[PDB]
Amino acid sequence: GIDLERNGRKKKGGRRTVKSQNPYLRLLVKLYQFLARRTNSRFNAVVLKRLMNPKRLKAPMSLSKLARHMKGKEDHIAVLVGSVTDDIRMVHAPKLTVCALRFSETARRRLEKAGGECLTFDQLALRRPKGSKCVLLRAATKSREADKHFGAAPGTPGSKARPYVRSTGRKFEKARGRRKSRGYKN
Amino acid sequence: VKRSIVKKRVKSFPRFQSDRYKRVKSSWRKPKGIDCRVRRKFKGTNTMPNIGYGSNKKTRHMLPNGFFKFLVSSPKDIELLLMHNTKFAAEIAHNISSRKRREILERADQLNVLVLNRSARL
Amino acid sequence: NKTWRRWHRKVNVTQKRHAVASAVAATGLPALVMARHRIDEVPELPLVVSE
Amino acid sequence: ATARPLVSVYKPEDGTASGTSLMPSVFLSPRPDLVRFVHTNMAKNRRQPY
Amino acid sequence: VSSELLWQCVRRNHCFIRKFNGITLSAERMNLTNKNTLKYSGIAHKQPLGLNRHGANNGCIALVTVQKCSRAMRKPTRAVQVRKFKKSKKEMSKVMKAVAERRPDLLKVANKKMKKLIRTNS
Amino acid sequence: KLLRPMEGVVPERTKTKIARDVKLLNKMKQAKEAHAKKVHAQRHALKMRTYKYVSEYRKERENLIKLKREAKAKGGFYKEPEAKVILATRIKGINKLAPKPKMILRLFRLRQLHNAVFIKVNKATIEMLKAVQPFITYGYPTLKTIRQLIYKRGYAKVGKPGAHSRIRLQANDIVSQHLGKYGIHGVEDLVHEIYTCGPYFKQANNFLWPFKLNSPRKGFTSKRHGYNEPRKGDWGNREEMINELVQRMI
Amino acid sequence: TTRLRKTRKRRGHVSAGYGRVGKHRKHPGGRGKAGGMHHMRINYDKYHPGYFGKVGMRHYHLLKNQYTCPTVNVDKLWSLVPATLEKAEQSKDKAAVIDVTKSGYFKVLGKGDLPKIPVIVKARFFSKIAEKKIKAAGGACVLTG
Amino acid sequence: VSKNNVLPN
RNA sequence: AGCAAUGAGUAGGAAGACGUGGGGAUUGUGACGAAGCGUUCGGCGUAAGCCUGCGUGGAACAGUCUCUAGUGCAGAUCUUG
RNA sequence: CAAACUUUAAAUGGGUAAGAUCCAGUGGUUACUUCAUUGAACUGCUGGGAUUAAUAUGACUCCAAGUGGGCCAUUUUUG
RNA sequence: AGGAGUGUUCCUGUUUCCGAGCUCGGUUUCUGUGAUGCUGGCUAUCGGUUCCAACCGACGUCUUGAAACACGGACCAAGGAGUCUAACAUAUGUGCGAGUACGGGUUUUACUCCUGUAUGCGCAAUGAAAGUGAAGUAGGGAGAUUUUGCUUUGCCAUUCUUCGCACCUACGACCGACCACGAUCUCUGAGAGAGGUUUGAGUUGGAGCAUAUCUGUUAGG
RNA sequence: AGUGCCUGAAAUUGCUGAAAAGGAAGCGAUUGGGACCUUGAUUCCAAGAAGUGCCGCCGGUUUGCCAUCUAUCCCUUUGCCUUCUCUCUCUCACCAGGUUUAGGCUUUGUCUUGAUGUAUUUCCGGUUCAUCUUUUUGGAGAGGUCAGCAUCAGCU
Numbered sequence A: 001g002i003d004l005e006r007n008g009r010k011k012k013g014g015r016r017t018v019k020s021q022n023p024y025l026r027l028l029v030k031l032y033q034f035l036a037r038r039t040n041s042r043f044n045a046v047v048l049k050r051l052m053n054p055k056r057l058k059a060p061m062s063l064s065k066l067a068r069h070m071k072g073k074e075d076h077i078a079v080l081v082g083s084v085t086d087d088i089r090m091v092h093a094p095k096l097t098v099c100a101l102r103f104s105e106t107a108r109r110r111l112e113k114a115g116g117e118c119l120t121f122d123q124l125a126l127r128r129p130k131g132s133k134c135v136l137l138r139a140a141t142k143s144r145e146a147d148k149h150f151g152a153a154p155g156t157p158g159s160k161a162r163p164y165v166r167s168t169g170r171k172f173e174k175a176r177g178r179r180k181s182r183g184y185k186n
Numbered sequence B: 001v002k003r004s005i006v007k008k009r010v011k012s013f014p015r016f017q018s019d020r021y022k023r024v025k026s027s028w029r030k031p032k033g034i035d036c037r038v039r040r041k042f043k044g045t046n047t048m049p050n051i052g053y054g055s056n057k058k059t060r061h062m063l064p065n066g067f068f069k070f071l072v073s074s075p076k077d078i079e080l081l082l083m084h085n086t087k088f089a090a091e092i093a094h095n096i097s098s099r100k101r102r103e104i105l106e107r108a109d110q111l112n113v114l115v116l117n118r119s120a121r122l
Numbered sequence C: 001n002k003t004w005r006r007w008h009r010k011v012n013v014t015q016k017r018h019a020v021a022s023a024v025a026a027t028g029l030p031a032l033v034m035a036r037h038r039i040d041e042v043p044e045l046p047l048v049v050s051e
Numbered sequence D: 001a002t003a004r005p006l007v008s009v010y011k012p013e014d015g016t017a018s019g020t021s022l023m024p025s026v027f028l029s030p031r032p033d034l035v036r037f038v039h040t041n042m043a044k045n046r047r048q049p050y
Numbered sequence E: 001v002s003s004e005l006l007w008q009c010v011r012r013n014h015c016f017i018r019k020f021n022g023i024t025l026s027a028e029r030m031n032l033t034n035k036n037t038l039k040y041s042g043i044a045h046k047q048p049l050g051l052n053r054h055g056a057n058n059g060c061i062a063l064v065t066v067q068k069c070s071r072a073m074r075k076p077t078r079a080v081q082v083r084k085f086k087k088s089k090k091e092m093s094k095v096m097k098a099v100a101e102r103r104p105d106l107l108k109v110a111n112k113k114m115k116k117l118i119r120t121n122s
Numbered sequence F: 001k002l003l004r005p006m007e008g009v010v011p012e013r014t015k016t017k018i019a020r021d022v023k024l025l026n027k028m029k030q031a032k033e034a035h036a037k038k039v040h041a042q043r044h045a046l047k048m049r050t051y052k053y054v055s056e057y058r059k060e061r062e063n064l065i066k067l068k069r070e071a072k073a074k075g076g077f078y079k080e081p082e083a084k085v086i087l088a089t090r091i092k093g094i095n096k097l098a099p100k101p102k103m104i105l106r107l108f109r110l111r112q113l114h115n116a117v118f119i120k121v122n123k124a125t126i127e128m129l130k131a132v133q134p135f136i137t138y139g140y141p142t143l144k145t146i147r148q149l150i151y152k153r154g155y156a157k158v159g160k161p162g163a164h165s166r167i168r169l170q171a172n173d174i175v176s177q178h179l180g181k182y183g184i185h186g187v188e189d190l191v192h193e194i195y196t197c198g199p200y201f202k203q204a205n206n207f208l209w210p211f212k213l214n215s216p217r218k219g220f221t222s223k224r225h226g227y228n229e230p231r232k233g234d235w236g237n238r239e240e241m242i243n244e245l246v247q248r249m250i
Numbered sequence G: 001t002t003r004l005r006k007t008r009k010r011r012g013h014v015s016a017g018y019g020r021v022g023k024h025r026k027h028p029g030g031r032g033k034a035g036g037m038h039h040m041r042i043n044y045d046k047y048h049p050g051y052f053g054k055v056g057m058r059h060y061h062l063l064k065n066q067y068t069c070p071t072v073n074v075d076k077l078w079s080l081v082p083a084t085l086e087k088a089e090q091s092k093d094k095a096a097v098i099d100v101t102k103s104g105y106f107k108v109l110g111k112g113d114l115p116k117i118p119v120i121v122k123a124r125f126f127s128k129i130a131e132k133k134i135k136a137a138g139g140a141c142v143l144t145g
Numbered sequence H: 001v002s003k004n005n006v007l008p009n
Numbered sequence I: 001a002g003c004a005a006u007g008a009g010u011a012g013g014a015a016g017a018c019g020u021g022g023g024g025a026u027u028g029u030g031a032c033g034a035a036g037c038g039u040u041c042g043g044c045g046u047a048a049g050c051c052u053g054c055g056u057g058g059a060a061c062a063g064u065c066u067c068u069a070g071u072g073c074a075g076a077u078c079u080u081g
Numbered sequence J: 001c002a003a004a005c006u007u008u009a010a011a012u013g014g015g016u017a018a019g020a021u022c023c024a025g026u027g028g029u030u031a032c033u034u035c036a037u038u039g040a041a042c043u044g045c046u047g048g049g050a051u052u053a054a055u056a057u058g059a060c061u062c063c064a065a066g067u068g069g070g071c072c073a074u075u076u077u078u079g
Numbered sequence K: 001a002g003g004a005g006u007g008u009u010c011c012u013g014u015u016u017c018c019g020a021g022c023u024c025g026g027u028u029u030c031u032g033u034g035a036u037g038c039u040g041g042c043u044a045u046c047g048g049u050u051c052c053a054a055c056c057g058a059c060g061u062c063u064u065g066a067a068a069c070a071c072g073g074a075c076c077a078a079g080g081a082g083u084c085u086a087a088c089a090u091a092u093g094u095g096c097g098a099g100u101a102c103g104g105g106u107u108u109u110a111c112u113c114c115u116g117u118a119u120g121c122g123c124a125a126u127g128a129a130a131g132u133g134a135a136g137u138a139g140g141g142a143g144a145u146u147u148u149g150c151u152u153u154g155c156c157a158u159u160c161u162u163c164g165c166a167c168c169u170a171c172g173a174c175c176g177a178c179c180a181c182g183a184u185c186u187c188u189g190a191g192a193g194a195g196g197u198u199u200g201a202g203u204u205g206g207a208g209c210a211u212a213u214c215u216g217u218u219a220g221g
Numbered sequence L: 001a002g003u004g005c006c007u008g009a010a011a012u013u014g015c016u017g018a019a020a021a022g023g024a025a026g027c028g029a030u031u032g033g034g035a036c037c038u039u040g041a042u043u044c045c046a047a048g049a050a051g052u053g054c055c056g057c058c059g060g061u062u063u064g065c066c067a068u069c070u071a072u073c074c075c076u077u078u079g080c081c082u083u084c085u086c087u088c089u090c091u092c093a094c095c096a097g098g099u100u101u102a103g104g105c106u107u108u109g110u111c112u113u114g115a116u117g118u119a120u121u122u123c124c125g126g127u128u129c130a131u132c133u134u135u136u137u138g139g140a141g142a143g144g145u146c147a148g149c150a151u152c153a154g155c156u
Helices: A023-039 A042-051 A063-069 A105-114 A121-127 B076-081 B098-110 C013-025 C030-035 D032-046 E003-010 E092-102 E107-118 F013-074 F099-107 F123-135 F143-152 F172-182 F188-195 F201-207 F242-249 G006-010 G083-089 G128-136
Strands: A077-085 A097-103 A117-119 A134-137 D006-010 D020-022 E017-020 E023-026 E049-053 E061-066 E080-085 F085-090 F115-120 F136-138 G071-073 G096-099 G107-109 G119-123 G140-143
Touching (some): A023 E003, A063 A077, A063 A134, A097 A105, A097 A121, A105 A117, E049 E092, E049 E107, E061 E107, E080 E092, F013 F172, F013 F188, F085 F242, F123 F136, F143 F188, F143 F242, G083 G096, G107 G119, G128 G140
Parallel strands (some): A077 A097, G119 G140
Antiparallel strands (some): E049 E061
8 A cells, every 4th residue: 555656566678588599699698697797897797788689789780880990999809799791892801800799701701811800709708808908889770671660750740751652753652742732741 | 395384275266156057167267257246356255366375485286295296107207206205205197007006116115215096906 | 271371481591501400410419319219339429331 | 519520430240440531510510499490390391281 | 518508409308308297307317316407417418427226126326427528428338337336335435436536516415315225126 | 615625535627716715715704803893993983972962862951941941030931943853644545635745745755654754844845744734744753752763663775776675774784884974873873863953864864764653552533633623633733742643653 | 370379368358359348340440541531531641641642744655674774883893893903903004894784784873982993994874973983093984885 | 541551552 | 595665457468377189209108998987085286277096988098398270168039959 | 786897916826947968268260240359159278166955766769459438526617 | 483413712692800091901600693491192183075054244248337127148068259361560589691582403202402594672862754873070978998086806986088889969061853053175065163941761881681470550251 | 788789978857865944045254063084203223034146256348547659620831733613813715823622641839549457347157245125023212293381582
């Protein structure tokens, strides 16, 4: 008999465990939750959380973007809880020393040839338990087909949301609403 | 083991109007009726099961004897209950022969493991 | 029950290959073979013999 | 498995033989997550329709 | 090779698991307790071991082991060693020594089982 | 804990783990001793500080009398100092509450029936209590009833924003670590800071989880009506006579 | 996986997940896109603006391939033909020729940046910007047809 | 027709 | 494992379990008696349900991990008997 | 005497403010503004300041259900 | 409060009394954290399954409202109601990643395995169309680094200047459309340069594709 | 199993036994009553029989602690050579050159062979002995259940 809001008992919104049945990812988390709990460094606490993320937050960073975040800071190990893709536009790949979950086989060839080390996360623990002189990165989350559609809903004044439309070009959602000559602009 | 044993209920939770109609069997079903008294919780009526009535963590699935039963099929499967004999009492299964009972029952006594069924088929 | 109920799955060819590799790996290790057989008299895994 | 040992090849007649060969780098490979998923879907492909 | 990786395959399912209610047990040789954990179980761990009454009418005890640092791991004839022991309080001291060479951590439970084992003849 | 190396039976990896246990136990042993010397020194400084409060409680009571005797000998009257702390208790329950009165009671941490809380007197905190009056019986405590609350019913809230745990005041080391900024090392130094109303009242009050009193041994009169009115009711403020109530609710 | 669906759990509840008041009626609100003009109008304005009306001049028998024109960028090209790059880095004489038709694009657009290696690009069409960028690189432009 | 989906076809 | 606070609920949402017919793998029971059925011999679980003595019965059935569905009834002036 | 008059005019309610997203000093940019380095807005640097009333207290994005017959009570109130 | 043990060495309490200036230190017996102590009845009671008594309680659906003088329901068994296909969409798991996934060749023959050439969707948008077709900065910020406060080799600072990911907020540049200019040329055109209370589902060193399941929308019995 | 004959549920019906009933009965919670079902532990020390048959000691057989010597795994390229594969690498029609595989060779720094035999399994004849099991005869030892009084710790 308490005047309490929800008598909370209030839950936490973020994910509380690993969802994968991938056994290697589970053992990765067991490492980095021993290492988070015991070591005290905030690097390991963040890496633990980012390991448990779903696929759309483990988004691929290109080799050419990974150059330019790591530009002034050449010595430091470039961590990315995520995948690493080759940039085809990048002609001469810079050497770096990357850690990540997964390299595509082009990007593994391109770094290793260019004089450039290519680590897993369990190897990063042996070198750098604290995360001393590392660079956390992550690929942009809101940069995909699906996330163009979100926001204020396309027929409202000054939204930049895409409509869900079956096909492109005229004859599809380009008349009443989109022209002033057809009723109204909005 | 054999710790104290406290039960909260000894009565079952019989299904509402199992007494009245023979088509309704006694196996519990929550009444989802809009006007039903049992779900609305008037006094002087069938009690509902809550998790409130849950027995102790230490003494869940615990027999009157003290043991937990672990039911068993072949002669090979009693060997499993060798180091856990104090903790577990073995129930010889529904289906088993007169022959294969007297192989099980005799092998159990070699292992000092209690068998619940006894004078099972004679 | 209509006949057009879609019975078959296309699995991807890469996931099919990764699977067979993983399954062939488990042919070695008497951990996984004993877990899933009787390997008392068997001299070795993987048990190779001549042509 | 982080090694490629020399495997003893055996006779038909006999439990030992001097023939040996190197392990072929498949038994290094990393997955019962995935083998479940595939076998599940791949076993459906021999269904006759009713 | 890895104990934890082999476990994350076969923890949930294997030939041995034998359930009833919340209980689960594990019928392999190389397993004190016969519980299904990473530590005790045969299959998964590096250097497992068992104490089993020997299978010669069960007159005497075996200590069943593997060669240390997983030497002959791919050759399961050669890997699995045995040492026979007489049922006594005196030959507890030889067993107590032989266990702690392989595994120091499993030593209290060896003393628990070996005591129980002596009391075991078909 | 020191592990048995087994002199009958040796590992290589285990000799690392035995070697650290000598380092750990030796640093623990000095730190158990050297911390116990500090707390021994601190509770001496508490013990002597406790006596001069027991002077100050008696002496200001005696000095209050000598003032209003002296002023009475003149001709005039001694207007006493107005009370700096009051002690609210909640009287009517949760259901059927207007949304402004519902808010104020949450701001006083009066979230259920028969809950006490020490609450400060400003002009602001008076004009809140006007709005709540008929769900509340408040008034001015004394050193007996404050001591009895914090000893018998005293719990203390402990943790980050999100979850605090509500822990029973069994020792001073709970009080010491949380309020050792502000003075306030012992349980008896709370009782000073509440009764006097110190500079660190807000810190010491919000440390205490609000008090959970049982129902009064001889009952209420009639919770409809005020403590004023000649039907002898309950709600409203009793200047002193809440002390007679709350001593039964313990 | 009928197992995993809500009906299985939902079974045993009378409404069946649709609610006692409103009910699962056969076709409230019309069928398909019907009612867009009147009752379902609020949904159309927002979500689907520009749906009603006709705009441009119609094309009878429009034929694709007449207009098709797959476009590579200037920032790529190199991906187009890795050995030549190590050839055309050196020498300062001859140049690595990129027939863009042979990989299968017609137009070239200079969205990107290119290394400064003399090169010749042959494409059916060149964007105005692409030409400026290529020339700066010391490259030459050639038209096919 | 409800919510933000494609108009069905 | 420890500590604290909390616990009403139709329409509705989500989570973990119980049960049924088949497929794959594995561990078994059975003409010295399987399935089903009956029962104040009984037991376990908050509960869905599970285990089991005795009687009848006369030929096949079950546990575990997975896959799959024509998978759970008191009602429909429901249908057939 | 006044619901469709008012000099005057409460209670109860409503707005905004109470500093780290701040204050001052000084230089620069400008097609604006000025008679004018006069202003204006934005910026670089250099000082001053850690919670500057009370009380309590951790504070977006996506997807979707049900619902769109309501009724009652204290005070206000229309036929 | 209860399977054993040893025993107070430390610790709080109470106490013997010795000294230093009510307070602290040293010392002796006693009791706690380390307490369950003594004793009896029955070996059938205790307990359990059934039926019965007694005191107190206790009158499916639409609806604001049902025990209703609202409707359905005599009894029992068995049968009986969100399914399948397609088009999308978000979410999540798995694979590969600027890519990604009708035939033929094998075969023990509906499985499996391999494979050439295209196409799909994606990698560029924008105009009705002719067509044309892409330079970052600031503020807050995860984390690292350099340094200042506290039980100590660990604890939290905002103490520092160093770089500041994602993302949000503010403003730019570039591309297409519209509007309004134009030095100079090989003058049906090109184009230095410079715009605009206009406009795009644009852009800013690319994330998608295939597959599995749920939920939703729509078509079909 | 006796001819609409395998098993043979419920509704319903007859008898027998058992209760209950003053204008309904059922039901919840709590006891009681009547039928009916159900219980010298665990051990410990001697002697005897019935089991069992370890090590030891031989013949045969199979593992190999530890000290040594050494292989390829792997990368480190070297001297290559052969067969593959990819490639807008070259006069170009063919050979050659890089890329990817395999193989036969090479310089170079914790999953095993061959010798030494801590130890160990299996196999019969033994050579009999340990061991522990159940049991029957004494000796020392009693759990279970329900109570009574006592002392404390909390709340009252």
